[PDB]
CSV table of C-alpha atoms and ligand atoms in Angstrom, one decimal:
chain,number,residue,atom,x,y,z
A,1,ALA,CA,0.0,-33.2,32.8
A,2,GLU,CA,-2.9,-30.6,32.5
A,3,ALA,CA,-6.5,-32.1,32.2
A,4,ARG,CA,-7.5,-29.2,30.0
A,5,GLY,CA,-4.5,-27.2,28.7
A,6,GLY,CA,-4.2,-23.6,29.9
A,7,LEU,CA,-7.1,-24.0,32.4
A,8,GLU,CA,-7.9,-25.3,35.9
A,9,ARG,CA,-10.8,-25.7,38.2
A,10,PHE,CA,-10.5,-23.5,41.3
A,11,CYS,CA,-12.4,-22.1,44.2
A,12,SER,CA,-14.1,-18.8,43.3
A,13,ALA,CA,-14.9,-16.9,46.7
A,14,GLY,CA,-18.7,-16.6,47.1
A,15,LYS,CA,-19.3,-18.6,43.8
A,16,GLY,CA,-18.2,-22.1,44.8
A,17,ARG,CA,-16.0,-23.8,42.2
A,18,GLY,CA,-15.1,-22.1,38.9
A,19,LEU,CA,-12.9,-22.1,35.9
A,20,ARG,CA,-9.6,-20.1,35.7
A,21,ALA,CA,-7.2,-19.4,32.8
A,22,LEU,CA,-3.5,-20.3,33.3
A,23,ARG,CA,-2.3,-18.5,30.2
A,24,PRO,CA,-3.7,-15.5,28.2
A,25,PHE,CA,-6.6,-16.1,25.8
A,26,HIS,CA,-7.4,-13.3,23.2
A,27,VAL,CA,-10.6,-12.6,21.3
A,28,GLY,CA,-11.8,-15.6,19.2
A,29,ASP,CA,-9.4,-18.1,20.9
A,30,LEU,CA,-10.8,-21.5,21.7
A,31,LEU,CA,-10.4,-22.3,25.4
A,32,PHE,CA,-11.8,-25.9,25.3
A,33,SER,CA,-14.4,-28.1,23.7
A,34,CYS,CA,-16.7,-30.6,25.5
A,35,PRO,CA,-18.7,-33.4,24.0
A,36,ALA,CA,-22.2,-33.8,25.4
A,37,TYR,CA,-22.5,-36.2,28.4
A,38,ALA,CA,-26.1,-36.7,27.4
A,39,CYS,CA,-28.4,-34.9,25.0
A,40,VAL,CA,-31.9,-35.1,23.5
A,41,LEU,CA,-33.3,-33.6,20.3
A,42,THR,CA,-36.4,-31.5,20.7
A,43,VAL,CA,-39.7,-33.2,19.5
A,44,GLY,CA,-40.3,-30.4,16.9
A,45,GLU,CA,-37.0,-31.2,15.1
A,46,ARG,CA,-37.6,-35.0,14.6
A,47,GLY,CA,-37.1,-35.9,10.9
A,48,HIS,CA,-35.2,-32.7,10.3
A,49,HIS,CA,-32.1,-33.2,12.5
A,50,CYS,CA,-30.3,-36.4,13.4
A,51,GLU,CA,-31.4,-37.6,16.9
A,52,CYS,CA,-27.8,-38.4,17.8
A,53,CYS,CA,-25.5,-35.6,16.5
A,54,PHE,CA,-28.2,-32.9,15.7
A,55,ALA,CA,-26.9,-32.6,12.1
A,56,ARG,CA,-29.4,-30.8,9.8
A,57,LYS,CA,-29.7,-33.2,6.8
A,58,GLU,CA,-32.2,-34.1,4.1
A,59,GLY,CA,-32.8,-37.8,3.7
A,60,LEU,CA,-32.1,-39.0,7.3
A,61,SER,CA,-32.5,-42.8,7.7
A,62,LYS,CA,-35.4,-43.7,10.2
A,63,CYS,CA,-35.5,-46.3,12.9
A,64,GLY,CA,-37.2,-49.4,11.4
A,65,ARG,CA,-39.3,-50.3,14.5
A,66,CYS,CA,-40.8,-47.0,15.8
A,67,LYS,CA,-40.3,-45.0,12.5
A,68,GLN,CA,-39.9,-41.9,14.8
A,69,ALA,CA,-36.1,-41.6,15.5
A,70,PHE,CA,-34.0,-40.3,12.5
A,71,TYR,CA,-30.3,-40.6,11.9
A,72,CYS,CA,-27.4,-39.5,9.6
A,73,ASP,CA,-26.3,-43.2,9.1
A,74,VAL,CA,-26.1,-46.5,11.0
A,75,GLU,CA,-23.1,-45.1,13.0
A,76,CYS,CA,-25.3,-42.3,14.6
A,77,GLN,CA,-28.1,-44.9,15.0
A,78,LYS,CA,-25.7,-47.3,16.9
A,79,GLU,CA,-24.3,-44.5,19.1
A,80,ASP,CA,-27.9,-43.5,20.1
A,81,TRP,CA,-29.2,-47.1,20.6
A,82,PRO,CA,-28.5,-47.3,24.4
A,83,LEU,CA,-30.8,-44.2,24.7
A,84,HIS,CA,-33.3,-44.7,21.9
A,85,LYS,CA,-34.0,-48.3,23.2
A,86,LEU,CA,-35.5,-46.7,26.4
A,87,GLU,CA,-38.2,-45.0,24.2
A,88,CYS,CA,-38.5,-47.0,20.9
A,89,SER,CA,-41.0,-49.7,22.2
A,90,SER,CA,-43.0,-47.0,24.2
A,91,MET,CA,-43.3,-44.8,21.1
A,92,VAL,CA,-44.8,-47.9,19.1
A,93,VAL,CA,-47.3,-48.9,21.9
A,94,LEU,CA,-48.4,-45.4,23.0
A,95,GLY,CA,-48.8,-43.0,20.0
A,96,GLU,CA,-49.1,-39.3,20.9
A,97,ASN,CA,-49.9,-40.5,24.4
A,98,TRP,CA,-46.1,-41.0,25.0
A,99,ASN,CA,-45.1,-37.4,25.8
A,100,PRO,CA,-42.4,-37.1,28.5
A,101,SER,CA,-41.1,-33.5,28.8
A,102,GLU,CA,-37.6,-32.7,27.3
A,103,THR,CA,-36.1,-32.4,30.9
A,104,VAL,CA,-37.6,-35.9,31.8
A,105,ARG,CA,-36.1,-37.4,28.5
A,106,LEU,CA,-32.7,-35.8,29.3
A,107,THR,CA,-32.7,-37.1,32.9
A,108,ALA,CA,-33.6,-40.6,31.7
A,109,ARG,CA,-30.4,-40.4,29.5
A,110,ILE,CA,-28.3,-39.2,32.4
A,111,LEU,CA,-29.6,-42.2,34.5
A,112,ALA,CA,-28.7,-44.6,31.6
A,113,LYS,CA,-25.2,-43.1,31.2
A,114,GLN,CA,-24.5,-43.1,35.0
A,115,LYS,CA,-25.3,-46.8,35.3
A,116,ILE,CA,-23.1,-47.9,32.4
A,117,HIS,CA,-20.0,-45.6,33.0
A,118,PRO,CA,-19.7,-44.8,36.8
A,119,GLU,CA,-16.1,-43.4,36.1
A,120,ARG,CA,-15.4,-39.9,34.8
A,121,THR,CA,-16.0,-39.5,31.0
A,122,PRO,CA,-14.0,-37.1,28.6
A,123,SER,CA,-16.8,-34.5,29.2
A,124,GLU,CA,-15.9,-34.5,32.9
A,125,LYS,CA,-12.2,-33.7,33.0
A,126,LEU,CA,-12.7,-30.8,35.5
A,127,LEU,CA,-16.3,-31.3,36.8
A,128,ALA,CA,-18.3,-34.5,37.1
A,129,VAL,CA,-22.1,-34.9,37.0
A,130,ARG,CA,-22.0,-36.5,40.5
A,131,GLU,CA,-20.4,-33.2,41.7
A,132,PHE,CA,-23.1,-30.9,40.4
A,133,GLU,CA,-24.7,-28.4,42.8
A,134,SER,CA,-28.3,-29.1,43.5
A,135,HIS,CA,-29.4,-26.3,46.0
A,136,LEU,CA,-32.0,-28.6,47.6
A,137,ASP,CA,-31.8,-26.4,50.7
A,138,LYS,CA,-32.9,-23.3,48.6
A,139,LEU,CA,-35.9,-24.9,46.7
A,140,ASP,CA,-39.2,-23.4,47.5
A,141,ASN,CA,-42.6,-25.3,47.6
A,142,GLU,CA,-43.4,-24.8,43.9
A,143,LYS,CA,-39.9,-25.9,42.8
A,144,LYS,CA,-40.2,-29.1,45.0
A,145,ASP,CA,-43.6,-29.8,43.5
A,146,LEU,CA,-42.3,-29.5,39.9
A,147,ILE,CA,-39.4,-32.0,40.6
A,148,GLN,CA,-41.9,-34.4,42.1
A,149,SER,CA,-44.1,-34.1,39.0
A,150,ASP,CA,-41.0,-34.8,36.9
A,151,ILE,CA,-40.1,-37.9,39.0
A,152,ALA,CA,-43.7,-39.3,38.5
A,153,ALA,CA,-43.5,-38.6,34.7
A,154,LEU,CA,-40.1,-40.5,34.6
A,155,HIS,CA,-41.6,-43.6,36.4
A,156,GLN,CA,-44.6,-43.4,34.1
A,157,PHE,CA,-42.7,-43.3,30.8
A,158,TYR,CA,-39.5,-45.3,31.6
A,159,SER,CA,-40.3,-47.8,34.5
A,160,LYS,CA,-40.4,-50.7,32.1
A,161,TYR,CA,-37.0,-50.0,30.4
A,162,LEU,CA,-35.0,-48.2,33.1
A,163,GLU,CA,-34.0,-49.1,36.7
A,164,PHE,CA,-34.1,-46.2,39.2
A,165,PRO,CA,-32.1,-45.1,42.2
A,166,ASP,CA,-34.0,-44.0,45.4
A,167,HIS,CA,-36.5,-41.1,45.3
A,168,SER,CA,-34.0,-38.7,47.1
A,169,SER,CA,-31.3,-39.4,44.5
A,170,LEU,CA,-33.9,-38.6,41.7
A,171,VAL,CA,-34.8,-35.3,43.5
A,172,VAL,CA,-31.0,-34.4,43.6
A,173,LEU,CA,-30.6,-35.4,39.9
A,174,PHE,CA,-33.5,-33.2,38.6
A,175,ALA,CA,-32.3,-30.3,40.9
A,176,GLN,CA,-28.8,-30.7,39.4
A,177,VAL,CA,-30.2,-30.7,35.9
A,178,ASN,CA,-32.0,-27.4,36.7
A,179,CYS,CA,-28.8,-25.5,37.7
A,180,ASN,CA,-26.4,-27.1,35.3
A,181,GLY,CA,-28.3,-27.9,32.1
A,182,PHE,CA,-27.9,-26.5,28.6
A,183,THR,CA,-30.0,-25.9,25.5
A,184,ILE,CA,-28.5,-26.2,22.1
A,185,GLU,CA,-29.6,-23.6,19.5
A,186,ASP,CA,-28.8,-23.5,15.8
A,187,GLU,CA,-27.3,-20.6,13.8
A,188,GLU,CA,-30.7,-18.7,13.9
A,189,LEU,CA,-31.0,-19.4,17.6
A,190,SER,CA,-33.8,-21.9,17.0
A,191,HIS,CA,-34.1,-24.5,19.8
A,192,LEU,CA,-32.6,-27.9,18.8
A,193,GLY,CA,-32.5,-29.8,22.1
A,194,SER,CA,-31.2,-30.1,25.7
A,195,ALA,CA,-27.9,-31.4,26.9
A,196,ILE,CA,-25.5,-31.9,29.9
A,197,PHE,CA,-21.9,-30.5,29.4
A,198,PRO,CA,-20.3,-31.1,32.8
A,199,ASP,CA,-17.0,-29.2,32.2
A,200,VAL,CA,-19.0,-26.3,30.6
A,201,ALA,CA,-21.2,-26.3,33.8
A,202,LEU,CA,-18.1,-25.4,35.9
A,203,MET,CA,-18.1,-21.8,34.5
A,204,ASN,CA,-19.7,-19.2,36.7
A,205,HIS,CA,-22.0,-16.4,35.4
A,206,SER,CA,-21.4,-12.8,34.5
A,207,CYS,CA,-23.6,-10.2,32.7
A,208,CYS,CA,-20.3,-9.1,31.2
A,209,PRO,CA,-19.1,-12.6,30.0
A,210,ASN,CA,-15.6,-13.1,28.7
A,211,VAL,CA,-16.5,-16.3,26.8
A,212,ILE,CA,-19.3,-17.6,24.5
A,213,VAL,CA,-20.5,-21.2,24.2
A,214,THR,CA,-21.4,-22.4,20.7
A,215,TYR,CA,-22.1,-25.9,19.3
A,216,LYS,CA,-20.6,-28.0,16.5
A,217,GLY,CA,-23.3,-30.6,16.4
A,218,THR,CA,-23.5,-31.7,20.1
A,219,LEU,CA,-19.9,-30.6,20.8
A,220,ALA,CA,-19.8,-27.5,23.0
A,221,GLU,CA,-17.0,-25.0,22.1
A,222,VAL,CA,-16.0,-22.1,24.5
A,223,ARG,CA,-14.3,-19.0,22.8
A,224,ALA,CA,-13.0,-15.8,24.4
A,225,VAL,CA,-15.0,-12.6,23.6
A,226,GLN,CA,-12.5,-10.3,25.5
A,227,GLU,CA,-8.9,-10.7,26.7
A,228,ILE,CA,-8.7,-13.3,29.4
A,229,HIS,CA,-5.6,-12.6,31.5
A,230,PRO,CA,-3.6,-15.3,33.4
A,231,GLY,CA,-5.4,-16.0,36.7
A,232,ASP,CA,-8.7,-14.6,35.4
A,233,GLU,CA,-11.9,-16.4,36.1
A,234,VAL,CA,-13.8,-17.6,32.9
A,235,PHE,CA,-17.4,-16.4,32.9
A,236,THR,CA,-20.2,-17.2,30.5
A,237,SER,CA,-23.7,-15.6,30.7
A,238,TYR,CA,-26.5,-18.1,31.8
A,239,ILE,CA,-29.3,-15.8,30.6
A,240,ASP,CA,-30.5,-13.4,27.9
A,241,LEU,CA,-28.6,-10.1,28.4
A,242,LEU,CA,-31.2,-8.0,26.7
A,243,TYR,CA,-33.2,-7.4,29.9
A,244,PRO,CA,-32.8,-4.8,32.7
A,245,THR,CA,-30.8,-5.6,35.9
A,246,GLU,CA,-33.9,-6.5,38.0
A,247,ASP,CA,-35.3,-8.9,35.3
A,248,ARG,CA,-31.9,-10.7,34.9
A,249,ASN,CA,-31.5,-11.1,38.7
A,250,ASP,CA,-35.1,-12.4,39.1
A,251,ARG,CA,-34.2,-15.1,36.5
A,252,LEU,CA,-30.7,-15.9,38.1
A,253,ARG,CA,-32.3,-16.2,41.6
A,254,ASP,CA,-35.2,-18.3,40.2
A,255,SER,CA,-33.1,-20.9,38.3
A,256,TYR,CA,-29.6,-20.7,39.9
A,257,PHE,CA,-30.2,-19.5,43.4
A,258,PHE,CA,-27.9,-16.5,43.4
A,259,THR,CA,-27.9,-12.7,42.9
A,260,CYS,CA,-25.3,-11.4,40.4
A,261,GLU,CA,-22.8,-8.8,41.6
A,262,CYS,CA,-21.1,-8.1,38.2
A,263,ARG,CA,-20.2,-4.5,37.0
A,264,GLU,CA,-23.4,-4.3,34.9
A,265,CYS,CA,-25.5,-5.4,37.9
A,266,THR,CA,-23.7,-3.0,40.3
A,267,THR,CA,-23.8,0.1,38.0
A,268,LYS,CA,-27.1,-0.7,36.1
A,269,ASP,CA,-25.8,1.7,33.3
A,270,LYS,CA,-27.7,-0.1,30.5
A,271,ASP,CA,-31.1,0.0,32.3
A,272,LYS,CA,-31.9,3.6,31.2
A,273,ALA,CA,-31.7,2.8,27.4
A,274,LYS,CA,-33.3,-0.7,27.9
A,275,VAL,CA,-36.6,0.8,29.4
A,276,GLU,CA,-36.6,3.6,26.8
A,277,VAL,CA,-39.7,5.9,27.0
A,278,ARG,CA,-41.0,8.2,24.2
A,279,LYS,CA,-40.4,12.0,24.3
A,280,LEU,CA,-43.9,13.4,24.7
A,281,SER,CA,-45.6,16.7,25.8
A,282,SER,CA,-46.1,15.3,29.4
A,283,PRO,CA,-43.6,13.2,29.7
A,284,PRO,CA,-44.4,9.7,31.4
A,285,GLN,CA,-44.4,9.8,35.2
A,286,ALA,CA,-42.4,7.2,37.1
A,287,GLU,CA,-45.6,5.5,38.4
A,288,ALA,CA,-47.0,5.2,34.8
A,289,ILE,CA,-43.5,3.7,33.6
A,290,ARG,CA,-43.7,1.2,36.5
A,291,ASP,CA,-47.3,0.2,35.3
A,292,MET,CA,-46.2,-0.3,31.7
A,293,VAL,CA,-43.1,-2.4,32.9
A,294,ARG,CA,-45.6,-4.5,34.9
A,295,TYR,CA,-47.9,-4.7,31.8
A,296,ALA,CA,-44.9,-5.7,29.7
A,297,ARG,CA,-43.6,-8.4,32.1
A,298,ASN,CA,-47.2,-9.7,32.2
A,299,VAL,CA,-47.8,-9.8,28.4
A,300,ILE,CA,-44.5,-11.8,28.2
A,301,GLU,CA,-46.4,-14.4,30.4
A,302,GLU,CA,-49.8,-13.8,28.5
A,303,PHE,CA,-48.0,-14.7,25.2
A,304,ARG,CA,-46.5,-18.0,26.7
A,305,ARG,CA,-49.9,-19.0,28.1
A,306,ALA,CA,-51.8,-18.2,24.8
A,307,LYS,CA,-49.6,-20.8,22.9
A,308,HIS,CA,-52.0,-23.5,24.4
A,309,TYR,CA,-55.4,-22.0,23.2
A,310,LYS,CA,-54.6,-19.4,20.5
A,311,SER,CA,-53.7,-19.8,16.8
A,312,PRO,CA,-50.4,-18.3,15.4
A,313,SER,CA,-52.6,-15.6,13.8
A,314,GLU,CA,-54.0,-14.8,17.3
A,315,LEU,CA,-50.6,-14.9,19.0
A,316,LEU,CA,-49.5,-12.3,16.3
A,317,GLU,CA,-52.5,-10.1,17.4
A,318,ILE,CA,-51.3,-10.2,21.1
A,319,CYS,CA,-47.9,-8.9,19.9
A,320,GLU,CA,-49.6,-6.2,17.7
A,321,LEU,CA,-52.0,-5.2,20.6
A,322,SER,CA,-49.1,-5.0,23.1
A,323,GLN,CA,-46.8,-3.0,20.8
A,324,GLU,CA,-49.6,-0.4,20.1
A,325,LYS,CA,-50.5,-0.1,23.9
A,326,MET,CA,-46.8,0.0,25.1
A,327,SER,CA,-45.9,2.7,22.4
A,328,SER,CA,-47.9,5.3,24.3
A,329,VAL,CA,-45.1,5.1,26.9
A,330,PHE,CA,-42.3,3.0,25.3
A,331,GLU,CA,-39.9,3.8,22.5
A,332,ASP,CA,-39.5,1.0,19.8
A,333,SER,CA,-35.9,0.5,21.2
A,334,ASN,CA,-37.4,-0.5,24.6
A,335,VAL,CA,-36.6,-4.2,25.5
A,336,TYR,CA,-40.2,-5.0,26.2
A,337,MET,CA,-41.2,-3.7,22.8
A,338,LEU,CA,-38.4,-5.8,21.3
A,339,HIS,CA,-39.5,-8.9,23.1
A,340,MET,CA,-43.0,-8.6,21.5
A,341,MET,CA,-41.5,-7.7,18.0
A,342,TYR,CA,-39.1,-10.7,18.2
A,343,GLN,CA,-42.1,-13.1,19.2
A,344,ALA,CA,-44.2,-11.5,16.4
A,345,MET,CA,-41.3,-12.1,13.9
A,346,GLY,CA,-41.2,-15.8,14.9
A,347,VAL,CA,-45.0,-16.1,14.4
A,348,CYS,CA,-44.6,-14.3,10.9
A,349,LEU,CA,-41.9,-16.8,10.0
A,350,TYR,CA,-44.1,-19.7,11.0
A,351,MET,CA,-47.1,-18.4,8.9
A,352,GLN,CA,-44.8,-18.0,5.8
A,353,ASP,CA,-45.3,-14.2,6.1
A,354,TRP,CA,-41.7,-13.4,4.9
A,355,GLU,CA,-42.5,-9.6,4.4
A,356,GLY,CA,-44.0,-9.3,7.9
A,357,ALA,CA,-41.0,-11.1,9.4
A,358,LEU,CA,-38.6,-8.8,7.4
A,359,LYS,CA,-40.3,-5.6,8.7
A,360,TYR,CA,-40.0,-6.8,12.3
A,361,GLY,CA,-36.3,-7.8,11.8
A,362,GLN,CA,-35.6,-4.3,10.4
A,363,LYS,CA,-37.0,-2.7,13.6
A,364,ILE,CA,-35.1,-5.1,16.0
A,365,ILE,CA,-31.6,-5.0,14.6
A,366,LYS,CA,-30.5,-1.5,15.6
A,367,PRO,CA,-31.7,-1.7,19.3
A,368,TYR,CA,-30.2,-5.3,19.5
A,369,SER,CA,-26.8,-3.9,18.3
A,370,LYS,CA,-27.0,-1.3,21.2
A,371,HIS,CA,-28.3,-3.5,24.0
A,372,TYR,CA,-26.2,-6.6,23.5
A,373,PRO,CA,-22.4,-7.1,23.7
A,374,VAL,CA,-20.2,-6.5,20.7
A,375,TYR,CA,-20.0,-10.3,20.1
A,376,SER,CA,-23.5,-11.6,20.8
A,377,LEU,CA,-25.1,-14.7,19.3
A,378,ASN,CA,-28.5,-12.8,19.4
A,379,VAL,CA,-27.1,-10.0,17.2
A,380,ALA,CA,-25.3,-12.5,14.9
A,381,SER,CA,-28.6,-14.5,14.5
A,382,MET,CA,-30.7,-11.5,13.9
A,383,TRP,CA,-28.3,-10.3,11.1
A,384,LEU,CA,-28.4,-13.8,9.7
A,385,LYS,CA,-32.3,-14.1,9.7
A,386,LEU,CA,-32.5,-10.6,8.1
A,387,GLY,CA,-29.9,-11.7,5.4
A,388,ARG,CA,-31.8,-14.9,4.7
A,389,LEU,CA,-35.1,-13.0,4.4
A,390,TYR,CA,-33.7,-10.4,1.9
A,391,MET,CA,-32.0,-13.3,-0.1
A,392,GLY,CA,-35.3,-15.2,-0.2
A,393,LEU,CA,-37.1,-11.9,-1.1
A,394,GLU,CA,-34.8,-11.3,-4.1
A,395,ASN,CA,-32.7,-8.5,-2.4
A,396,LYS,CA,-29.2,-9.9,-2.8
A,397,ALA,CA,-27.4,-6.6,-2.1
A,398,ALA,CA,-29.0,-6.1,1.4
A,399,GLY,CA,-28.9,-9.9,1.9
A,400,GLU,CA,-25.2,-10.2,1.3
A,401,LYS,CA,-24.4,-7.2,3.6
A,402,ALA,CA,-26.5,-8.7,6.4
A,403,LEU,CA,-24.9,-12.2,6.0
A,404,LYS,CA,-21.5,-10.6,6.1
A,405,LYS,CA,-22.3,-8.8,9.4
A,406,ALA,CA,-23.4,-12.2,10.8
A,407,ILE,CA,-20.2,-13.9,9.6
A,408,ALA,CA,-18.0,-11.2,11.2
A,409,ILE,CA,-19.4,-12.0,14.7
A,410,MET,CA,-19.7,-15.7,14.1
A,411,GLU,CA,-16.0,-15.8,13.1
A,412,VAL,CA,-15.2,-14.8,16.7
A,413,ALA,CA,-17.9,-16.8,18.6
A,414,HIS,CA,-18.1,-20.0,16.4
A,415,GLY,CA,-14.5,-20.0,15.0
A,416,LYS,CA,-13.5,-19.0,11.5
A,417,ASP,CA,-13.7,-22.7,10.3
A,418,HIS,CA,-17.2,-23.4,11.7
A,419,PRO,CA,-19.5,-25.3,9.2
A,420,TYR,CA,-22.2,-22.5,9.7
A,421,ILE,CA,-19.7,-20.0,8.2
A,422,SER,CA,-19.0,-22.2,5.1
A,423,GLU,CA,-22.8,-22.7,4.7
A,424,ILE,CA,-23.4,-18.9,4.8
A,425,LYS,CA,-20.5,-18.2,2.4
A,426,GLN,CA,-22.0,-20.9,0.0
A,427,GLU,CA,-25.4,-18.9,0.3
A,428,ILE,CA,-23.6,-15.7,-0.9
A,429,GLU,CA,-22.0,-17.5,-3.9
A,430,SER,CA,-25.2,-19.4,-5.1
B,501,SFG,N1,-21.9,-14.9,39.4
B,501,SFG,C1,-22.2,-15.8,40.4
B,501,SFG,N2,-22.3,-15.4,41.8
B,501,SFG,C2,-22.6,-16.4,42.7
B,501,SFG,N3,-22.8,-17.7,42.5
B,501,SFG,C3,-22.7,-18.1,41.1
B,501,SFG,C4,-22.4,-17.2,40.1
B,501,SFG,N4,-22.4,-17.9,38.8
B,501,SFG,C5,-22.7,-19.1,39.1
B,501,SFG,N5,-22.9,-19.3,40.6
B,501,SFG,C6,-23.1,-20.5,41.3
B,501,SFG,O1,-22.8,-21.6,40.5
B,501,SFG,C7,-24.0,-22.3,40.1
B,501,SFG,C8,-24.1,-23.0,38.7
B,501,SFG,C9,-22.9,-23.9,38.3
B,501,SFG,N6,-23.3,-24.4,36.9
B,501,SFG,C10,-21.5,-23.2,38.2
B,501,SFG,C11,-20.3,-23.9,39.0
B,501,SFG,C12,-20.6,-23.8,40.5
B,501,SFG,N7,-19.9,-22.5,41.0
B,501,SFG,C13,-20.1,-25.1,41.2
B,501,SFG,O2,-19.3,-25.0,42.1
B,501,SFG,O3,-20.5,-26.2,40.8
B,501,SFG,C14,-25.1,-21.5,40.5
B,501,SFG,O4,-26.3,-22.2,40.8
B,501,SFG,C15,-24.6,-20.7,41.7
B,501,SFG,O5,-24.6,-21.6,42.9
B,502,ZN,ZN1,-25.9,-38.0,13.1
B,503,ZN,ZN1,-37.1,-46.9,17.3
B,504,ZN,ZN1,-24.7,-9.3,36.5
C-alpha cells in the first residue's frame, strides 16, 4: 500500500529529501492534506478564532479558569486541553507578564506531543518531526544566540508544567522549527498562527512552484498550480515571490541555508519590472538606483522597528514619506513602492480609514497581477480585500467583480468546495 496515494518521498540531488509525484496532477488537483502536528493561535486573534481549530466564530465559549483561551465547543476545548494546561495556570498567576513568543509556544507544544506519542502520527506518513533538518553546522553566532534566548524563555514560561530533554536536544528542536515551520494565514492573508506540518515540510522550494499550500482550519491542503508530470518533484515556495532574485535568495540563505537555482533565479527575467524606475529627463544612473534599493530595503526595516515606538498614524507617515522619496526614482509598480503601499493599506484598515485603504488597494492590484504567478494567494487576497472594501463602501458592482476575480483563483488554490468560497458567494448574494 501507498502511505500517500500518487506520491512518494525521494532523494532530490543537492536538495536532500523531497516529494515526487507517481501519477499526473493537473491544475487545481489536491495532492494531499495534512493535519497540524502542533499549532498555536496568534495572541492578536484570541477571542476571535478558536484556539484549537482556528475557526472564525462569534460567541466562542471561554476557558472557565483563565478566561483567556476561547473555543468552538467543549470538543475543541478537550482536544486543546493537553496543550492549554501548560499555559492556563501561568496566564492566571502572571497577567500580561506571561508573554512567551509564538515560536516558544509552538515548541512547547511539540515537546508535549513528542512525549505522549513517540510513534509517527498521521501528519508524519512521509516525514517525521524527529527527521527534520536542523542545519546546526551552518548557524552563525546571531542565530545561535537567538535559539539560546528561546530556550531560556521556554524554561522561564513552562518549567513548572513541562519536563525538558537536554539543552542540545532543545537547540536541535528550535533549529528544526526554524527550517520546517509554517504560518497559517486567513483568506485576506492575515496572520492566524504558527504550526508544524511534517509531511508538508518534505516539499522543497522553487520560485516557480507547482503547488500551493492552503488551510481548512488547521488542516493543510496542497493543490497543483501547474501540470505535475509523473516523476516530477513537487515544489512549493517558502517565501514571498514579489521580491527580486537577490532579496529572495538573501531570505532563503538566512532562514533555510541554501541558495535557490530555479529558472527564475537563474534567468532573473522578472527583476527588471520588479525594480521599475520612472522615465525622466535624466534618467536614473545605476549608482542612484542602487542607493534607492538600499534606502528601500532599509525603510522595510525602519517600518518594522517603528512598530515599537510609533502610533499607527505615525507608521502611515513612514509609508507616505518613503513613497514620495522613492517616487523620484521608482515607478509605482516597483516592488519596494508596493511593499510600503501594502503596509500603508494595513495601517489604514487598522485605523478604520476604508477610503485610504481602498485607494492603496487600487494602486497595488495591477502590479501584483504582473509580478506574482497566475495563481497566487497574494493576488487572490488583494482582489478579496478590494472587493470587501467596495462592498462595505456601497459599490456593489465593483465589489462583485473583485470578489469574482478572488473566487476564480481560490477555486484552484483552495478547491472549489472550500468554505471561504461559500462565504464569499454568500457576500455576493446578501
Ligand atoms: N530549492 C532547494 N535547493 C536546495 N536545498 C533546498 C531547496 N528547497 C529546500 N531545500 C533544503 O530543504 C530544507 C527545508 C525542508 N523543509 C525541505 C525537505 C528537506 N529537503 C529535507 O530533506 O528534510 C532547506 O533548509 C534546505 O536544506
Ligand atoms: Zn474549534
Ligand atoms: Zn484556561
Ligand atoms: Zn528560485
